[PDB]
Design an enzyme around this catalytic site. Structure first.
Site, PDB file in Angstrom:
ATOM      1  N   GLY D  10       0.803  -1.203   0.000  1.00  0.00           N
ATOM      2  CA  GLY D  10       0.000   0.000   0.000  1.00  0.00           C
ATOM      3  C   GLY D  10       0.842   1.261   0.000  1.00  0.00           C
ATOM      4  N   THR D 145      -6.213  -1.222  -0.179  1.00  0.00           N
ATOM      5  CA  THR D 145      -5.022  -2.047  -0.373  1.00  0.00           C
ATOM      6  C   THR D 145      -4.388  -2.421   0.960  1.00  0.00           C
ATOM      7  OG1 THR D 145      -4.688  -0.781  -2.404  1.00  0.00           O
ATOM      8  CG2 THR D 145      -2.932  -2.268  -1.734  1.00  0.00           C
ATOM      9  N   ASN D 206      -2.592   8.251  13.646  1.00  0.00           N
ATOM     10  CA  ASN D 206      -2.041   9.474  13.071  1.00  0.00           C
ATOM     11  C   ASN D 206      -2.181  10.677  13.996  1.00  0.00           C
ATOM     12  OD1 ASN D 206      -0.968   8.472  10.744  1.00  0.00           O
ATOM     13  ND2 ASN D 206      -2.415   9.474   9.356  1.00  0.00           N
ATOM     14  N   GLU D 254      10.983 -13.525  21.464  1.00  0.00           N
ATOM     15  CA  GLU D 254      11.072 -13.340  22.909  1.00  0.00           C
ATOM     16  C   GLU D 254       9.837 -12.625  23.443  1.00  0.00           C
ATOM     17  OE1 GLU D 254      13.972 -14.653  23.894  1.00  0.00           O
ATOM     18  OE2 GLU D 254      13.750 -14.383  26.056  1.00  0.00           O
TER      19      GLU D 254
HETATM   20  N1  LIG Z   1       1.257   7.921   9.658  1.00  0.00           N
HETATM   21  C1  LIG Z   1       1.157   7.956   8.334  1.00  0.00           C
HETATM   22  N2  LIG Z   1      -0.017   7.565   7.724  1.00  0.00           N
HETATM   23  C2  LIG Z   1      -0.129   7.597   6.375  1.00  0.00           C
HETATM   24  C3  LIG Z   1       0.934   8.016   5.594  1.00  0.00           C
HETATM   25  N3  LIG Z   1       0.550   7.953   4.301  1.00  0.00           N
HETATM   26  C4  LIG Z   1      -0.722   7.493   4.248  1.00  0.00           C
HETATM   27  N4  LIG Z   1      -1.160   7.280   5.529  1.00  0.00           N
HETATM   28  C5  LIG Z   1      -2.476   6.762   5.947  1.00  0.00           C
HETATM   29  O1  LIG Z   1      -3.066   5.985   4.922  1.00  0.00           O
HETATM   30  C6  LIG Z   1      -4.470   6.102   5.009  1.00  0.00           C
HETATM   31  C7  LIG Z   1      -5.139   5.847   3.664  1.00  0.00           C
HETATM   32  O2  LIG Z   1      -4.467   4.843   2.935  1.00  0.00           O
HETATM   33  P1  LIG Z   1      -3.625   5.245   1.623  1.00  0.00           P
HETATM   34  O3  LIG Z   1      -2.604   6.309   1.945  1.00  0.00           O
HETATM   35  O4  LIG Z   1      -4.570   5.724   0.549  1.00  0.00           O
HETATM   36  O5  LIG Z   1      -2.887   3.889   1.164  1.00  0.00           O
HETATM   37  P2  LIG Z   1      -3.706   2.509   1.054  1.00  0.00           P
HETATM   38  O6  LIG Z   1      -4.011   1.981   2.432  1.00  0.00           O
HETATM   39  O7  LIG Z   1      -2.918   1.504   0.255  1.00  0.00           O
HETATM   40  O8  LIG Z   1      -5.040   2.886   0.241  1.00  0.00           O
HETATM   41  P3  LIG Z   1      -5.013   3.111  -1.352  1.00  0.00           P
HETATM   42  O9  LIG Z   1      -3.902   4.062  -1.724  1.00  0.00           O
HETATM   43  O10 LIG Z   1      -6.339   3.668  -1.804  1.00  0.00           O
HETATM   44  O11 LIG Z   1      -4.779   1.782  -2.021  1.00  0.00           O
HETATM   45  C8  LIG Z   1      -4.721   7.511   5.516  1.00  0.00           C
HETATM   46  O12 LIG Z   1      -5.810   7.525   6.409  1.00  0.00           O
HETATM   47  C9  LIG Z   1      -3.450   7.890   6.246  1.00  0.00           C
HETATM   48  O13 LIG Z   1      -3.699   7.955   7.629  1.00  0.00           O
HETATM   49  C10 LIG Z   1       2.116   8.413   6.198  1.00  0.00           C
HETATM   50  O14 LIG Z   1       3.061   8.793   5.509  1.00  0.00           O
HETATM   51  N5  LIG Z   1       2.224   8.382   7.571  1.00  0.00           N
HETATM   52  N1  LIG Z   2      24.169 -12.195  37.333  1.00  0.00           N
HETATM   53  C1  LIG Z   2      23.691 -11.955  36.088  1.00  0.00           C
HETATM   54  N2  LIG Z   2      22.379 -12.191  35.840  1.00  0.00           N
HETATM   55  C2  LIG Z   2      21.850 -11.968  34.616  1.00  0.00           C
HETATM   56  C3  LIG Z   2      22.725 -11.461  33.552  1.00  0.00           C
HETATM   57  N3  LIG Z   2      21.960 -11.328  32.454  1.00  0.00           N
HETATM   58  C4  LIG Z   2      20.703 -11.719  32.784  1.00  0.00           C
HETATM   59  N4  LIG Z   2      20.636 -12.092  34.075  1.00  0.00           N
HETATM   60  C5  LIG Z   2      19.429 -12.587  34.777  1.00  0.00           C
HETATM   61  O1  LIG Z   2      18.867 -13.679  34.050  1.00  0.00           O
HETATM   62  C6  LIG Z   2      17.443 -13.625  34.086  1.00  0.00           C
HETATM   63  C7  LIG Z   2      16.896 -14.028  32.725  1.00  0.00           C
HETATM   64  O2  LIG Z   2      17.538 -15.225  32.292  1.00  0.00           O
HETATM   65  P1  LIG Z   2      17.740 -15.460  30.716  1.00  0.00           P
HETATM   66  O3  LIG Z   2      18.807 -14.535  30.185  1.00  0.00           O
HETATM   67  O4  LIG Z   2      16.438 -15.259  29.981  1.00  0.00           O
HETATM   68  O5  LIG Z   2      18.223 -16.984  30.573  1.00  0.00           O
HETATM   69  P2  LIG Z   2      18.287 -17.620  29.098  1.00  0.00           P
HETATM   70  O6  LIG Z   2      16.890 -17.935  28.628  1.00  0.00           O
HETATM   71  O7  LIG Z   2      19.110 -18.881  29.130  1.00  0.00           O
HETATM   72  O8  LIG Z   2      18.915 -16.626  28.154  1.00  0.00           O
HETATM   73  C8  LIG Z   2      17.072 -12.192  34.428  1.00  0.00           C
HETATM   74  O9  LIG Z   2      16.134 -12.174  35.509  1.00  0.00           O
HETATM   75  C9  LIG Z   2      18.360 -11.512  34.846  1.00  0.00           C
HETATM   76  O10 LIG Z   2      18.242 -11.036  36.188  1.00  0.00           O
HETATM   77  C10 LIG Z   2      24.143 -11.228  33.901  1.00  0.00           C
HETATM   78  O11 LIG Z   2      24.948 -10.798  33.049  1.00  0.00           O
HETATM   79  N5  LIG Z   2      24.537 -11.490  35.152  1.00  0.00           N
END
Ligand SMILES: Nc1nc2c(ncn2[C@@H]2O[C@H](COP(=O)(O)OP(=O)(O)OP(=O)(O)O)[C@@H](O)[C@H]2O)c(=O)[nH]1
Ligand SMILES: Nc1nc2c(ncn2[C@@H]2O[C@H](COP(=O)(O)OP(=O)(O)O)[C@@H](O)[C@H]2O)c(=O)[nH]1
Ligand SMILES: Nc1nc2c(ncn2[C@@H]2O[C@H](COP(=O)(O)OP(=O)(O)OP(=O)(O)O)[C@@H](O)[C@H]2O)c(=O)[nH]1
Ligand SMILES: Nc1nc2c(ncn2[C@@H]2O[C@H](COP(=O)(O)OP(=O)(O)O)[C@@H](O)[C@H]2O)c(=O)[nH]1
Ligand SMILES: [Mg+2]
Ligand SMILES: [Mg+2]
EC number: 3.6.5.-
Lengths: 439, 91, 430, 439, 428
Positions: D10, D145, D206, D254
């Site tokens: 889109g 789209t 937006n 994660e």
């Molecule tokens: N935040 C943000 N929103 C956007 C931007 N450009 C378009 N939009 C959003 O897109 C919505 C409408 O969709 P379109 O821009 O026409 O694109 P589309 O979803 O593919 O729809 P069609 O072009 O008709 O196929 C609007 O309500 C905008 O909010 C942008 O650059 N930034």
């Molecule tokens: N002592 C110590 N503890 C850590 C460190 N990094 C993460 N932890 C602890 O490990 C816990 C999460 O374990 P995790 O990293 O997810 O284990 P994994 O799944 O094997 O990677 C958290 O609660 C942290 O407090 C470290 O460098 N030193």
């Protein structure tokens, strides 16, 4: 000493031969004059030209080909152009009047006049051969000379030469586009003869190469010169195991055994990869696994038939260039895993590989990019039965009201041969049904 | 791009390149950016789409080629790589 | 004093033999010209096993290279060590086999073997006391297996009491590179069962796995694979040339390994292989070398020894070392692996010790295992053969040349009998 | 190694994607020409670009991105401007006709012709990925789209790719200001396929960006370029765990588990802090304990909903820059002691943290400043109960008199789909009622 | 002679193990190149406990590093002391676990632990007389906890009569960094009760409190936290490598500490830990070191010792000191704290002394407490577990991977049984 004879017959057989012999001159470093370059060292170890060219004592090369046709308007373009002194004068044989899209004029009336002259060249060319490997015949099914004169030339050649493997490179008629009205007639009358006297027969059509040149080579408006360079790469890739040394060499008789499981089925499909333009080759990473996966895609097939309808009997993969042998075998075992690609249950071992060392050569300033690796695939499928069930529908519908018949029977053939040729083709599609069923 | 296969990088179409009878020949105000732009330029008979930028040389072979840094099995079997300690300058 | 005549058939056999001749010329100190460039007298002490003298002290190999296609002959001759062979030992045909067993055994194998047996006879009565013949081939082709097994039959008929050693590249499940591979494999095995004294099975899946997971190379060339094959090939027969503490030649290994006249297929091995970056973290010691020997990752046949029972095991160590570190290590591994060695043969293992190590390396070993796990390879060949033969695919290329349809059934029955013998002896108690 | 594929669909997808890839190339050092620059560090051995750029032997890097749209006015801007070097010619897929804000046109008529082409691009880019983590789909609830095409894009993606993660970055329809008139119709039909084809879907609207840009940035006239610069900072904050090493590493799978309590509630809220104007920072430098309070302020929330009306389910905070783990512990214990911020009684472990080492980067011509440490918050609240409460009141007021229905029913879909999708959202508003109560 | 094989599991375990290997490398005098550069000949007497000799006089550690993401292995290999490990001991997966115990036990762990046991069997069979195994992990994550319990189960059922140590970073109440943390902790303790000889509990609450109060760092980095953990890990196993007046190795402490076969969770503690500021003015003794040992604010676990009765106490000393000043201090601290020690086990305190202290310190401490204060930790885990489990929050990810509903109730029943056993042996 292993070496081949290429016989170009028909108009499209000659025009492919201009692009095939242009590629062989550039691959072996032979000028259009017919001589090696003068600004060359003494070197050594250069016997790769013996397969396609014969050394004269003065230093000239003469190609081992006979350019035969029944009209002089396409051969005179070769006798005057750039390669007018590469060829022997008697290797370019011209008729007097063309076949005019008739199988009868190509077989009975006109083609009988010059066949004593055509075969005298072949015996003269074969007498120079220390060891002969086979034949290669280029023709088209829709034409008069490509269908008529190719039938009697192969029938007479099978009598004299016992067990030399003769190949066919045929332009099968396209399912949608056609440049003739009498095209289904000349295609049916060809396939009745070629089941008996051909060891192998490869299939291409012009409609499938049009779609490749638009989506891959980015050519909006292709030309018959652009198609004949795609076909010429496959012929230079099949024969490349004979000329240049490699890790795994596959001769012509070696892939006769590995593609023909039954004596009545010898129709493979040709596929070459990668074919990309210079704009896209600068972005892509052309690994071994990418070019292997590019042959199994349905868009890259050079015949307008869907391989998902049928099952693969056997496949033959012929790599070139700096391809390591492992990345071949790791890529194949990925293909066997996927459930969309289907194999018959009586052929579990379906792949044969062959690695060459010399990378592919292209024409400078051409359409294809310069890549040091490629792959050419010759796969046997049961999906070709749909490509013939469409053609017999065009033959049956046209013959029911007896149209275009009096041009054929007015030259000497009988009306019964039209129904005899059709009744054999009905047996051929039953042969694909009885092999496609699973035990 | 200039450096890779330095012999003349393939350059896009320009005003001096266009000859008589070419399909891209135009009447009126003519620049180079129009021939470089994709939506203005047209395809030609038996030739691919124009480059619209600069590509490497004619004899440049595309794709990723990996050159092995190893010595192979002669280096793997023919010698045992025993560690050699470096003496230091005596501070 | 005991002479081994070497024989090359086919592309795979020719390349493997060329690499083997390179390896042993390197070991014995022979330059590619053909003269002697060595540093010790122990190299010329036993050199008549593989080399014949010439005028002016030039050594030529005792090998015959035969093929049905001269391209491989040119490729071998234009190589690094291609100038040492006798040009009369190159026997080539003019028509290729085309990967067809009938072409290799009946049609084109009828006219060449007259000259082949003339050459091998002219070499055979030039020795003092011939030890035997060595042939390298591949079972998946038309020239290597087809003409190869015919040469097996003719040589076995001519010389009844000799040693016949074959190094055969058996097919593989996932690196199957030919479609008539089960046909050629069964038709070659049916002849190799009853006409060969020793057969060593080499598998490309195992070779690729060694080149990937142990050595960690990036471009595993066929030159590297042939070097792996040639290492074991030249390590098996090292006690015929180099003196050692405990000698064991080919007949010694054959007598101590094969129990029954049909079970003579072996799985080879090599033992000091480690990657380039892990060389300095490891010590060349006998326990480490024995553990790496009995590890299942160094087998050159893709059959897991954990799926069967070991009948006999032979190992040839090279390098100056003690004897307790050999005997005690083998006793410990046999006492620890109680459930993987058979119980009706006590002392399943044999060792030999050689005093001269390979060049540049301190210690080495070569492993030869007889196992009931090769029935897995034979079964996977047999089921493919059955699946092709029921629908009779690819058989007109065989039967259009003079082969009946009863020979395939007879060969399949013979190979199923061999598999039944393996299963019978695996499942056997007191 | 670890890497992801980003798909932009889109007009809202492509125009956001222009702001993202100008941020990523500068962050890794790749020129707009597509190459690593001159006088670079020899033997650096960097693989930080491997997550989002593919190496080629010519020295070029190609992004792993697909730009999908149905009309050529938005894609041809990329093909003509200064980033025409970087992208592959076929990664930019362009249609012929636009959906004209019809979900029926983007799902039944126009989107069915190019869906075969788009999914083929996804396979060829995922083929290189030895290990893939997930997809990044950029869309909006407003247009057809972004409503129709994105619905069956991820429908086929979930079937072919089984358990791979998929994140939707959606532009929520603002409660007061909006462009389209049939915009309430699109959002009801958009999310009907999202409750059972999306692993996660992040929520930014937006209008709340406008008040942040007016007050924090002191910009009186924000532009759609400025809005997409704030979006790209959040997306680059999520992927900063993949490309750069840190104290605590949070993978894409994660927080995919750690933010979704039930298979129907997968709409987190994003919030960035600090987002300051260029002028203010030089005199004053921030701390960890003060940027945590800026996340929970309803003035600095990036969604027009009041967090004080609802209760929090879980929070996923990402810290980037010079942040120590002790100061994060002190900041969270400060938050839970406050009475305004409330957490549900069945989630005592209410938070989740992530620390990285590389600070956010700036661009030439941007609106933000160089800030030493910044924090991005992903939260799951019951405060979005009011968000769909009013768009359901916009759906029925349109649908009570059956207006703007005859355009949608003329392009393929029946009448009962509006009522079928209506009762699904009447069930979802009751789902927050049964969950948010304390047991 | 008596060997210990080290195993790092998860990111936290890998960083802890890398810091430990650096610590004992500086203890035994090994440069990061690999060779030996020391002063005392007594350092090479007992070096086979942790190092393997190569050719050319290089020593390589007996460590195996396992996880599911190769980024941690790359970060460790690019570290300061990262070139000493063997290049074949790194085994890694390609996909993450996402803190999913079901992924780290059932779906993803089933592919890698075959190779992990393949490596571990080779290391354990290359030795002469193996003492046992160390495994470092944390009880909050899917990569750490689940794969650690599965690895411990496989190694225990393969080697039946050995010694097994698990150094577990136990989850803390207010430093919650994971929302499925009580689920992972309960599911991992359910296996650690029945399959492990010793488990050592480490609390981030107590780590941060110690680093803020008695070390006074402004920035308590994870490197310094793993340094403080590595001090205790190196201090526990110093009787194996260094001679002492009184010896107490792993089984010596294991028999002496655990009264009943389900009570093997220990609270570590280190005593001569001092603020960075004033080295020059003073020297240590034994009563001061004992006071700083038994101070409740220096415990490395978030369980107040004064909220329960000590079952057993272990004190390992390092340096040159008399033993009357050790026995007298144990006696008078037990006489001073009458209520905090159990009534039916006189002389609750065991001691050991080694001659060689850590480098740069005259005297050094090591404390191991087995007390009834861990029942509040298990109670506070169980309350959060049942509060989440009553409404079935975050459960569909775990139960869609092939693991049922009743296993959480089995783990909860096990936890309630364990906290009943603590009160049963506390009040007697
Ligand atoms: N935040 C943000 N929103 C956007 C931007 N450009 C378009 N939009 C959003 O897109 C919505 C409408 O969709 P379109 O821009 O026409 O694109 P589309 O979803 O593919 O729809 P069609 O072009 O008709 O196929 C609007 O309500 C905008 O909010 C942008 O650059 N930034
Ligand atoms: N002592 C110590 N503890 C850590 C460190 N990094 C993460 N932890 C602890 O490990 C816990 C999460 O374990 P995790 O990293 O997810 O284990 P994994 O799944 O094997 O990677 C958290 O609660 C942290 O407090 C470290 O460098 N030193
Ligand atoms: N692939 C390919 N096909 C061609 C080429 N030229 C002609 N054909 C095909 O040839 C078919 C008909 O044969 P013709 O080219 O007319 O020539 P012919 O086969 O000798 O038949 P006659 O002219 O009657 O003798 C057409 O349907 C074309 O498809 C070519 O250059 N390349
Ligand atoms: N190990 C190894 N195997 C090879 C080599 N060359 C060919 N092969 C194998 O041999 C099989 C085909 O044998 P083939 O060459 O057709 O036998 P031939 O026709 O008698 O020479 C293939 O499956 C290859 O894998 C080689 O150099 N080394
Ligand atoms: Mg004509
Ligand atoms: Mg639009």
């Amino acid at each position: 000493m292993r070496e081949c004879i290429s016989i170009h017959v028909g108009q499209a057989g000659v025009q492919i031969g201009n692009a095939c012999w242009e590629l062989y001159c550039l691959e072996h470093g032979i000028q259009p004059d017919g001589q090696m370059p003068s600004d060359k060292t003494i070197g050594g170890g250069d016997d790769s030209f013996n397969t396609f060219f014969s050394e004269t004592g003065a230093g000239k090369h003469v190609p081992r080909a006979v350019f035969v046709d029944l009209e002089p308007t396409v051969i005179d373009e070769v006798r005057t152009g750039t390669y007018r002194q590469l060829f022997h004068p008697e290797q370019l044989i011209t008729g007097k009047e063309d076949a005019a899209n008739n199988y009868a004029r190509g077989h009975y009336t006109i083609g009988k006049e010059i066949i004593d002259l055509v075969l005298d060249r072949i015996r003269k060319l074969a007498d120079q051969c220390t060891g002969l490997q086979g034949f290669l015949v280029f023709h088209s099914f829709g034409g008069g000379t490509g269908s008529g004169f190719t039938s009697l030339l192969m029938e007479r050649l099978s009598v004299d030469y016992g067990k030399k493997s003769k190949l066919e490179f045929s332009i099968y008629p396209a399912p949608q586009v056609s440049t003739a009205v009498v095209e289904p007639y000349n295609s049916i009358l060809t396939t009745h003869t070629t089941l008996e006297h051909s060891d192998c027969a490869f299939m291409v059509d012009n409609e499938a190469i049009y779609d490749i040149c638009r989506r891959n080579l980015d050519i909006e408006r292709p030309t018959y010169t652009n198609l004949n360079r795609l076909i010429g790469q496959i012929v230079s890739s099949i024969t490349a195991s004979l000329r240049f040394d490699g890790a795994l060499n596959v001769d012509l008789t070696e892939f006769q055994t590995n593609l023909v499981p039954y004596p009545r089925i010898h129709f493979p499909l040709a596929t070459y990869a990668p074919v990309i333009s210079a704009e896209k080759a600068y972005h892509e990473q052309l690994s071994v696994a990418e070019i292997t996966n590019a042959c199994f895609e349905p868009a890259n097939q050079m015949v307008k038939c869907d391989p998902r309808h049928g099952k693969y009997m056997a496949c033959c993969l012929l790599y070139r260039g700096d391809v390591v042998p492992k990345d071949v075998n790791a890529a194949i075992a990925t293909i066997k895993t996927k459930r969309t690609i289907q194999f018959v249950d009586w052929c579990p071992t379906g792949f044969k590989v062959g690695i060459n060392y010399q990378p592919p050569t292209v024409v400078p300033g051409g359409d294809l990019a310069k890549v040091q690796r490629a792959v050419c695939m010759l796969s046997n499928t049961t999906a070709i039965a749909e490509a013939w069930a469409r053609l017999d529908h065009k033959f049956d519908l046209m013959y029911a009201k007896r149209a275009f018949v009096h041009w054929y029977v007015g030259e000497g053939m009988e009306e019964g041969e039209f129904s005899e040729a059709r009744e054999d083709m009905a047996a051929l599609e039953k042969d694909y049904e009885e092999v496609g069923v699973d035990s | 791009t200039v450096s890779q296969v330095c012999p003349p990088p393939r350059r896009p179409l320009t005003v001096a390149d266009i000859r008589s009878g070419m399909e891209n020949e135009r009447l009126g105000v003519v620049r180079d950016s129009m021939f470089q732009n994709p939506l203005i330029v047209k395809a030609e008979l038996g030739k691919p789409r124009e480059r619209s930028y600069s590509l490497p040389g004619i004899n440049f072979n595309y794709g990723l080629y990996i050159r092995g840094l190893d010595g192979g099995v002669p280096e793997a079997i023919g010698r045992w790589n025993v560690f050699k300690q470096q003496p230091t300058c005596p501070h | 004093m005991r002479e081994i005549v070497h024989l090359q058939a086919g592309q795979c056999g020719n390349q493997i033999g060329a690499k083997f001749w390179e390896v042993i010329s390197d070991e014995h100190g022979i330059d590619p010209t053909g003269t002697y460039h060595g540093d010790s007298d122990l190299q010329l002490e036993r050199i008549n096993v593989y080399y014949n003298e010439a005028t002016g002290g030039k050594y030529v190999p005792r090998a015959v290279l035969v093929d049905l296609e001269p391209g491989t002959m040119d490729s071998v001759r234009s190589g690094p060590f291609g100038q040492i062979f006798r040009p009369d030992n190159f026997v080539f045909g003019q028509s290729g086999a085309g990967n067809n067993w009938a072409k290799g055994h009946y049609t084109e194998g009828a006219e060449l073997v007259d000259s082949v047996l003339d050459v091998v006879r002219k070499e055979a009565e030039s020795c003092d006391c011939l030890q035997g013949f060595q042939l390298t081939h591949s079972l998946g082709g038309g020239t290597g297996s087809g003409m190869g097994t015919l040469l097996i039959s003719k040589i076995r008929e001519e010389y009844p009491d000799r040693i016949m050693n074959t190094f055969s590249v058996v097919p593989s499940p996932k690196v199957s590179d030919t479609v008539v591979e089960p046909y050629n494999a069964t038709l070659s095995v049916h002849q190799l069962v009853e006409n060969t004294d020793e057969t060593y099975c080499i598998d490309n899946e195992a070779l690729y796995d060694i080149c990937f997971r142990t050595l960690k190379l990036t471009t595993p060339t066929y030159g590297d694979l042939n070097h792996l094959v040639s290492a074991t090939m030249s390590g098996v027969t090292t006690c015929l040339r180099f003196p050692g503490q405990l000698n064991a030649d080919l007949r010694k290994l054959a007598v101590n390994m094969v129990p029954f006249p049909r079970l003579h297929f072996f799985m080879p091995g090599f033992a000091p292989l480690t990657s380039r970056g892990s060389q300095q973290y490891r010590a060349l010691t006998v326990p480490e070398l024995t553990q790496q020997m009995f590890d299942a990752k160094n087998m050159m046949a893709a059959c897991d020894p954990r799926h069967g029972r070991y009948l006999t095991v032979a190992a040839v160590f090279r390098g100056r070392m003690s004897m307790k570190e050999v005997d005690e290590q083998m006793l410990n591994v046999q006492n620890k692996n109680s459930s993987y060695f058979v119980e009706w043969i006590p002392n399943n293992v044999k060792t030999a010790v050689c005093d001269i190590p390979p060049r540049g390396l301190k210690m080495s070993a070569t492993f030869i295992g007889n196992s009931t796990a090769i029935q897995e390879l034979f079964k996977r060949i047999s089921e493919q053969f059955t699946a092709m033969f029921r629908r009779k695919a690819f058989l007109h290329w065989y039967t259009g040349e003079g082969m009946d349809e009863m020979e395939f059934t007879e060969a399949e029955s013979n190979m199923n009998d061999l598999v039944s013998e393996y299963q019978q002896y695996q499942d056997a108690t007191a």
